[PDB]
Amino acid sequence: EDKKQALLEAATQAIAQSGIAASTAVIARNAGVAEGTLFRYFATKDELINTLYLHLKQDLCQSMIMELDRSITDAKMMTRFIWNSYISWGLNHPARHRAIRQLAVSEKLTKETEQRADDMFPELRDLCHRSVLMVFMSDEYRAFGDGLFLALAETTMDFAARDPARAGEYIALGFEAMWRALTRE
Amino acid sequence: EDKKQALLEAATQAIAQSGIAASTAVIARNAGVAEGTLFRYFATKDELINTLYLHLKQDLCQSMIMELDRSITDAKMMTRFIWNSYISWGLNHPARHRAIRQLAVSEKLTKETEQRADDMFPELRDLCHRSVLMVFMSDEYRAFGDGLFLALAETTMDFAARDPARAGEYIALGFEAMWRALTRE
Numbered sequence: 001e002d003k004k005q006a007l008l009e010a011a012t013q014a015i016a017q018s019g020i021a022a023s024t025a026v027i028a029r030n031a032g033v034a035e036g037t038l039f040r041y042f043a044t045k046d047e048l049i050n051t052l053y054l055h056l057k058q059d060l061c062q063s064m065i066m067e068l069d070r071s072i073t074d075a076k077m078m079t080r081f082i083w084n085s086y087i088s089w090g091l092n093h094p095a096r097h098r099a100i101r102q103l104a105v106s107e108k109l110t111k112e113t114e115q116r117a118d119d120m121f122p123e124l125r126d127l128c129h130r131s132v133l134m135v136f137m138s139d140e141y142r143a144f145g146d147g148l149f150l151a152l153a154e155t156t157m158d159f160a161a162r163d164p165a166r167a168g169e170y171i172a173l174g175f176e177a178m179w180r181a182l183t184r185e
Numbered sequence: 186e187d188k189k190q191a192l193l194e195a196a197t198q199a200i201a202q203s204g205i206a207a208s209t210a211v212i213a214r215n216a217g218v219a220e221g222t223l224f225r226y227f228a229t230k231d232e233l234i235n236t237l238y239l240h241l242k243q244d245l246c247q248s249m250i251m252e253l254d255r256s257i258t259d260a261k262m263m264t265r266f267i268w269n270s271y272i273s274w275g276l277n278h279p280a281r282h283r284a285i286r287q288l289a290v291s292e293k294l295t296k297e298t299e300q301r302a303d304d305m306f307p308e309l310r311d312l313c314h315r316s317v318l319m320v321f322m323s324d325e326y327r328a329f330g331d332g333l334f335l336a337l338a339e340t341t342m343d344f345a346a347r348d349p350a351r352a353g354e355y356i357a358l359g360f361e362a363m364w365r366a367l368t369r370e
């Protein structure tokens with residue numbers, strides 16, 4: 001029923017379809033509400049980008065909480081579980097993936113948003129006792145590394161969706177491509 | 186002036202924007218010509234996909250001919266030159282990249298088209314005396330491996346285009362991600 005969730009869902013769809021340029025008028029209309037109502041929730045496109053990114057990240061991380069087992073010590077096994085979690089989430093919720101990938105490479109996420117993103121799920125930190133995933137790049141390239149992860153993830157989802165009889169095969173082959181590209185031992 | 190090239194350019198733009206579903210009416214209109222005229226060049230959407238794919242592949246390969254040096258013996262160095270060639274071509278011709286990537290994962294390329302694609306530029310074969318690039322996957326996954334190459338390439342082009350002061354850095358970091366993902370020694 002509640003208007004914030006309706007606006008966040010409408011913003012998810014609109015950005016998934018149109019990118020960050022998506023219109024607040026269209027988003028407000030697709031929700032129940034007047035555009036003025038939308039502005040009381042997010043006064044700027046910049047704040048909507050930041051709010052929606054944290055919303056989508058929270059949703060993903062909660063799905064990962066449901067799926068992840070902590071008897072796992074092996075970094076590669078833990079990374080595979082994370083990858084499987086992300087692919088499932090984007091196959092279940094294609095617009096949430098499409099939206100988050102455009103928000104992630106928008107140049108509009110604030111340092112406050114990054115810290116709230118890094119903080120929100122302590123349970124998902126570390127899960128490596130020191131880390132393997134994308135720690136080899138300079139800080140300037142962390143967004144680029146995230147973009148490559150998302151590109152490999154999106155291609156894996158596309159083939160698994162089109163050819164579901166081999167979905168697990170695409171997910172495993174995509175994981176090993178991601179692992180080689182974005183880790184070092 | 187010539188109508189085939191005008192239609193192939195209009196088909197490139199339309200598929201880049203809309204995918205393989207792009208309308209022959211729109212393509213014909215964006216070219217000089219009546220839709221009936223378009224059908225004398227490609228009687229089906231299937232034949233346009235195949236014809237346009239070979240056209241775009243020929244264009245890419247000719248650009249690679251202009252750029253590539255044959256004193257190169259090292260497989261990694263040769264693969265880097267190929268990658269640099271592809272990224273330059275897609276930054277110079279974004280719609281040609283966007284089109285070819287949708288055609289490549291369309292399920293509509295004919296075996297005849299594949300053989301003509303494999304044959305067209307003997308000069309680009311081998312350039313490895315036995316090969317490293319994507320020879321580790323089963324034949325069923327060659328399209329998937331091509332999709333991962335294209336995804337990594339597209340992300341590299343996006344960041345190089347947005348942040349041209351570091352274009353070479355994104356190209357080098359993207360190459361090493363592609364190389365790790367899609368080769369084995």
Ligand SMILES: C[C@H](CCC(=O)O)[C@H]1CC[C@H]2[C@@H]3[C@H](O)C[C@@H]4C[C@H](O)CC[C@]4(C)[C@H]3C[C@H](O)[C@]12C
Nearest residue numbers: 057061064082086100104124125133146149150
């Ligand atoms: C939750 C999990 C483990 C915790 C961590 O190491 O940060 C991490 C590792 C890689 C992360 C992902 C990658 O950084 C790529 C994406 C980046 C976006 O900014 C968030 C979604 C995105 C898909 C990330 C979600 C989540 O924070 C992931 C999946």
Ligand SMILES: C[C@H](CCC(=O)O)[C@H]1CC[C@H]2[C@@H]3[C@H](O)C[C@@H]4C[C@H](O)CC[C@]4(C)[C@H]3C[C@H](O)[C@]12C
Nearest residue numbers: 242246249267271285289309310318331334335
């Ligand atoms: C021309 C060059 C070397 C010759 C070869 O080994 O086939 C090859 C190696 C990898 C090839 C690319 C990859 O297979 C990924 C893409 C696949 C598409 O079907 C054609 C474009 C595409 C971008 C390919 C163009 C070209 O055939 C490439 C770049």
